[PDB]
Amino acid sequence: ATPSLRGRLARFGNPRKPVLKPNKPLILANRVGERRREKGEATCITEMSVMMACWKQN
Amino acid sequence: PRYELALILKAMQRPETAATLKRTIEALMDRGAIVRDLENLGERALPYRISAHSQQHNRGGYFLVDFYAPTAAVESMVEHLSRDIDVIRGNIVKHPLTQELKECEGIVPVPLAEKLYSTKKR
Amino acid sequence: KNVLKIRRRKMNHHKYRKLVKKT
Amino acid sequence: YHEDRIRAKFYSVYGSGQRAFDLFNPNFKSTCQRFVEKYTELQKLGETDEEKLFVETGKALLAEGVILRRVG
Amino acid sequence: RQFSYLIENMARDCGEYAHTRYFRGGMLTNARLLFGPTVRLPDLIIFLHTLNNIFEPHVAVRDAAKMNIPTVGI
Amino acid sequence: AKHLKFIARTVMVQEGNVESAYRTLNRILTMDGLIEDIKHRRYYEKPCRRRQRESYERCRRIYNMEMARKINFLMRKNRADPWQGC
Amino acid sequence: TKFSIYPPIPGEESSLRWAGKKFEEIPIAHIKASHNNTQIQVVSASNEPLAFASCGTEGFRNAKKGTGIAAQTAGIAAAARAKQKGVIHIRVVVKGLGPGRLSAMHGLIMGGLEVISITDNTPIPHXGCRPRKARKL
Amino acid sequence: REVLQLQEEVKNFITRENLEARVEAALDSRKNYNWAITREGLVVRPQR
Amino acid sequence: SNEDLPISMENPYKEPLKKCILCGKHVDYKNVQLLSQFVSPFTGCIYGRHITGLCGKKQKEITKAIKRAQIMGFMPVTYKDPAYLKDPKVCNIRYRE
RNA sequence: AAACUCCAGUUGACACAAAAUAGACUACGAAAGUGGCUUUAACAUAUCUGAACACACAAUAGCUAAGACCCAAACUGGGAUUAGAUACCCCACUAUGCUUAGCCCUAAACCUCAACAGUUAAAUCAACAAAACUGCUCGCCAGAACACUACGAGCCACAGCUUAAAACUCAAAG
Ligand code: FES
């Protein structure tokens, strides 16, 4: 669906307390977020440990 | 008013369950209860291990006591079941059939809320 | 809104409490 | 329009027939309005009952030769 | 854009004019600078579509009013 | 726990595919909220902070679900331009 | 037949045997993946200790214990000791979201054991003891 | 009509006379409250 | 005036109002089978209404009945009773896809 | 690092502590506040407004006894960092958070937007914020700063709270 927005913000008609307190108006922007690059992680740590273990034995 | 006693017993043999059930039904009567019916839900395995009266229980017989009693009889019967060592767990609730379910009209999907912000150019 | 007017009362109150403690 | 009640009922009982609407022809009549016309014409006689009238209309349109499915 | 060719043809056939393209700012309010000091502006503007391609009033509707040019509009 | 063991949060390994099992386990825990709850339960989140975070996440879901609905609604119009040139 | 991801119900009859032993009878590998350490203890189906290994027991110290490579060696060390006592198939019960949660499992299979099931047992209070205050970082 | 309906039910209430009798009879029955439902809203009751 | 003008009616094409599967059915804490349908097989977590597809009334009733059935020794808490892992799936949740 | 090593890891037994999921719900209460289960009792007013000479309440923190002790924790002590570090980081532990019986009466107690009755018509409309308004009533305000201050008075409050100025100073403050 989308969660309701009826009687959720502090407005004059609204008798109850605000449920939501948005920092920025809940209004769609005309852009979308930039694709964030995936953080890198060390690679081939398993194969490295296999190699480093043989070194210690030999 | 009408109540229900959700009675988990100690998975005993017929003489002992019959003995235990008779105790409970009399103790209700002794406190002014009009016992309406007794139901056997069967001996199941407990959803989880219940420790009661210095024993670890894994199975138990499930029973229901439909009865009418004065409102003051509830506290007294609750305390009575505390001291019965053949009851694994006993809870008294308002009878679920006393409440009449209101007719429902249907799910009405929520329209998107409007006029939350002024129509000014930001 | 900034808190420049709270900060004046903040220091006033702090100094006053320290003054009462000293005396 | 009052005919809309009849259209709704026909769509609920029988639904949109295999007949494909031709919205280009300004005088196109669908099996629905065909059904409606019969219903409306039989009402001119003086029948004030829907149950009896509907059973008649459904079979009076079958006398003309129609493809209907009452269960779905 | 579905009818830009039709409207451009129709304008040529009746010996009149068409602007079915991106409307550059100031064509009407700044015509003596965009065309030349002696240019003659339209005496009538026919809008066959009054909304631009973001579903808002075409800028020329307002600019025609500023220049005191009557407009016809669908 | 008083409950039975090897029933909750338990996934069977198929054909020794450990990586795929642990992956499905992770999904279950995440899809039910357990992962995020454990992380937030490391330090005490004060009631004022919890309410500020729940409001932020709920304002976020609305916006995210409304943008996703507008993207999905307009996806049909990404097709090739039919009046190319005019 | 459809492979079931749900573990065999103990009471119900089952055909799944891995070394002639029923699901109930397969030893268990308990993995404690802490933020700073990983501990692996293999027990028999009757709760008899068979092998234990942690990142500290393998020589890693201080922050080096809180790594995947340190958690993996502990899995290999535990597997070596568990195979000496006759362990082949193990049920895995992981507890915590530390760095060596999956690396320890890698060390176990890399050490020759065969995982038949994965179970998570991270403690989640329902509501319980108040955790420590937030860090000002 | 309520009092009428109520008057009929009281004939089967557990009194001290029909106590052991009713306890033995209850120990032989097994009332089930378990029924499942489907995506179309149809009660599926376990057959025995 | 004229008879061909729109008649002030109510919408005859209005569809029947969607009711939830549990509409009109008594939810009971003793009916663990029904209650189990609405919890996670793996964690025993209660599903939200966006998964169960329930209305406000019946989500609350199911929620309240589960919390009662659990503490009264009828329904397990940390998982779904293995006896009910074959009940009709009614929840809009997929763990494999 | 210090710390622990009567310590960790499976398993069993075991709260006077706190209440995952549900909750994408938006309900109850005068506000404060209220989200584990059960039961009992129970959520004022058939016009409205209205007590800063009154009453009854009022988060957190504190105070007075008397208990409880899992965890969290001002203070404090160690470890670390640093030019110093009376902090931020680590460990430990206390008041305190809980119960009971009395106090204390304060919060950015703010959704900084009063109650009641209405209107989206006009000219909406300084800016921003949560669009502009009408009737009616009460409560509040009238440059900044001195000042959540001093005096006086009341208060179970004695480093308290509530009421609350002036002189000198400024040409701004906002
Ligand atoms: S739609 Fe009727 S109970 Fe939910």
Strands F10-12 and G114-120, by their bridges, are: antiparallel
Host H or E run for residue D42: helix D31-45
**Smallest Cα–Cα separation from F21: which of G89, G96, G132, G115?**
G115
Question: Structure tokens of G121?
Answer: 């047992």
List residues bridging with E47 in a β-sheet.
E73
Look up tokens 């129509």; give the residue: B119
Host H or E run for residue G74: helix G68-84
Contacts of B116 (CB under 8 A, 6+ apart): A5, A9, A11, A26
How far apart are alpha carbons F39 and F42 in whole angstroms?
6
DSSP for chain I, written as a single string: --SSSPP----TTPPPPP--TTTT----TT-HHHHHTTB-TTT-PBPPHHHH---HHHHHHHHHHHHHHHHTTSS-SSS--GGGTTSPP-S---S--
Question: Structure tokens of F5?
Answer: 């063991």
How far apart are alpha carbons C19 and I44 in whole angstroms?
60
User: Which CATH fold would you assign to the domain B2-94?
Assistant: Alpha-Beta Plaits (3.30.70)
How far apart are alpha carbons F78 and F55 in whole angstroms?
34
**Smallest Cα–Cα separation from G106: which of B51, I6, F22?**
F22
How far apart are alpha carbons F71 and A34 in whole angstroms?
15
Technique that determined the structure: cryo-EM
List residues bridging with G39 in a β-sheet.
G32, G54
Pick out residues 16-75 of chain I having their CB under 7 A from any atom of nucleic acid strand J.
43-50, 56, 59, 62-64, 67-68, 71-72
Resolution in A: 2.4
Q: After which residues is chain H broken (C to N over 2.5 A)?
A: none
Host H or E run for residue D10: helix D3-13
Where do the structural domains in chain I lie, given as residue ranges?
2-97
Look up tokens 């930001």; give the residue: B122
List residues bridging with G22 in a β-sheet.
G17
Question: Structure tokens of B65?
Answer: 């006591």
Contacts of B3 (CB under 8 A, 6+ apart): B66, B67, B68, B69, B74, B92, B93, B94, B95
Pick out residues 78-107 of chain G having their CB under 7 A from any atom of nucleic acid strand J.
95
Where do the structural domains in chain B lie, given as residue ranges?
2-94
| Nucleotides of strand J lying closer than 7 angstroms to a protein CB | 1, 8-15, 17-29, 33, 36-41, 70-74, 88-91, 97, 108, 111-113, 124, 128-132, 145-150, 159-160, 174
Q: Are G29 and G75 in contact (CB under 8 A)?
A: no
Question: Structure tokens of G127?
Answer: 């509501």
Tell me, in Å, how far CA of B15 is from C1' of J76? 66
Q: Long-range contact list for A47-54, CB < 8 A, 24+ apart?
A: A49/G69, A49/G72, A49/G73
Contacts of D6 (CB under 8 A, 6+ apart): D35, D36, D39, D40
How far apart are alpha carbons E14 and E70 in whole angstroms?
19
Q: Are E31 and E39 in contact (CB under 8 A)?
A: yes
Report the pocket of ligand 1 as residue ranges, CB < 6 Å. Answer: B 104, 106-107; I 19-20, 23, 55, 57-58
Positive or negative CA dihedral for I12, I18, I22, I23?
negative
How far apart are alpha carbons F31 and I43 in whole angstroms?
11
**Smallest Cα–Cα separation from F58: which of B64, G64, I50?**
I50
Q: What SS3 class is residue H30?
A: coil
How far apart are alpha carbons D6 and I23 in whole angstroms?
30
Residue type, G21: K
Q: What SS3 class is residue H26?
A: helix
**Smallest Cα–Cα separation from E26: which of E44, E39, E15?**
E39
- C-alpha separations of I69 from B2, B43, I46, I73 in Å: 19, 16, 13, 6
Q: What SS3 class is residue E67?
A: coil
Q: What SS3 class is residue A45?
A: helix
CA geometry: angle B95, B99, B102, nearest 5 deg = 155
Q: Are I31 and I68 in contact (CB under 8 A)?
A: no
Q: What SS3 class is residue H36?
A: strand
Contacts of B89 (CB under 8 A, 6+ apart): B6, B8, B50, B52, B60, I72, I73
CA geometry: angle G10, G12, G15, nearest 5 deg = 90
- Residue A31 exposed, middle or buried by CB count within 10 Å (0-12, 13-18, 19+): exposed
SS (H, E, C) F46-58: CHHHHHHHHHHHH
Edge-first strand listing for the sheet containing B87-94: B34-51, B56-68, B2-9, B87-94
Check if I6 contacts D (Cβ < 8 Å): yes
